[PDB]
């Protein structure tokens, strides 16, 4: 019966170790997934905003071309104001 005590204790330790294992496992995993999702989020954010910068740059270039008849931004702006 001391034997049975030992046996139940072994079983319980097995269960507890398994549970701790899997819990810590999934915990690490979900943390990793969080970090990843947010990382790619930041990435595409930067992408889109650099795109927007370049976009408005091309826009103001078109506008400068229209004037035919940041530093360079305010420069062209002042030039257009003077022309006006």
């Amino acid at each position: 019966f001391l034997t049975n005590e030992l046996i139940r204790l072994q079983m319980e330790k097995l269960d507890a170790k398994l549970n701790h294992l899997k819990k810590l496992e999934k915990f690490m995993e979900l943390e990793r997934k969080t970090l990843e999702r947010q990382q790619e989020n930041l990435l595409i954010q930067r992408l889109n905003f650099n795109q927007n910068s370049s976009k408005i740059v091309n826009v103001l270039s078109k506008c400068l071309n229209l004037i035919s008849d940041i530093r360079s931004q305010i420069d062209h702006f002042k030039s257009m104001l003077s022309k006006p």
Binding site: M11, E25, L47, S54, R71
Partner: protein, 257 residues
């Protein structure tokens, strides 16, 4: 081989905790894959660190740009690397490239105005972007405390990775010793298994077990030495009335003999 880490196939599985310590070993393999990919994960996370130069918010490397540049990216200073990656993506989005080398890109005033003095206007080309990289790495990057910060960057994770590797190696040999013990106790288990099988088979009906083990011992004696086909059959009646291949084999013999 497979013998060395384990032998557990079936042992009558008496008090079948073998499934449980099985599962334990399985989860060990689980942790093994885990740690492996974690090392790889830390490698990967490092990967970007030596190549990034964005941190500005908390000698001084941010060199100013040219009027052309602030017309291009609208940004005034920083590193050349950031600017060149930017114009790289610029080419990508405007798709002025060509793919027959690929670095040949159809030039545009949005770009050629970066080098108008050499009469590049004489030829808007589809030329190697590498030529521009060579052009814009000093041609338009020019000028016109926080030293501690150089510490808090890529080196950090590298160092901690080294520490982790070191302590893992520290713990390894204990694991090796435990594996040796595993092999030992496994072999002992194996022998004891053999003994139990033997003994219970004796428990079954000792007459047959005794006869069989005796004969097997004798046979082992013989095979461990020279071997003879038949210990018996001096009792001719049996093996000859109850057998006839003797006839055919004989026939074959006498033809030559």
């Amino acid at each position: 081989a497979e013998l060395i880490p384990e032998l557990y196939s079936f042992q009558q599985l008496v008090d079948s905790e073998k499934r449980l310590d099985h599962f334990i070993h399985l989860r060990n393999l689980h942790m093994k894959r885990m740690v492996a990919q974690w090392e790889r994960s830390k490698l990967s996370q490092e990967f970007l660190y030596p190549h990034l130069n964005f941190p500005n918010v908390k000698e001084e490397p941010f060199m100013s740009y040219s009027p052309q540049l602030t017309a291009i990216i609208g940004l005034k200073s920083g590193t050349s690397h950031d600017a060149i990656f930017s114009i790289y993506k610029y080419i990508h989005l405007n798709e002025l490239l060509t793919n027959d080398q690929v670095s040949i890109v159809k030039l545009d005033t949005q770009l050629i105005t970066l080098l108008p003095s050499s009469l590049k206007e004489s030829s808007p080309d589809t030329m190697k972007l590498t030529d521009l990289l060579s052009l814009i790495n000093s041609t338009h990057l020019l000028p016109l405390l926080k030293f501690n910060n150089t510490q808090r960057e890529s080196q950090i994770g590298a160092a901690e990775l080294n520490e982790n590797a070191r302590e893992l190696e520290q713990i390894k040999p204990k694991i090796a010793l435990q594996d040796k013990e595993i092999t030992s106790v496994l072999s002992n288990l194996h022998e004891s298994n053999k003994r139990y099988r033997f003994f219970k088979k004796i428990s079954e009906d000792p007459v047959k077990a005794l006869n069989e083990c005796i004969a097997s011992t004798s046979n082992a004696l013989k095979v461990l030495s020279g071997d003879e086909g038949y210990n018996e059959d001096m009792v001719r009646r049996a093996n000859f009335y109850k057998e006839n291949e003797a006839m055919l084999r004989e026939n074959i013999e006498v033809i030559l003999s």
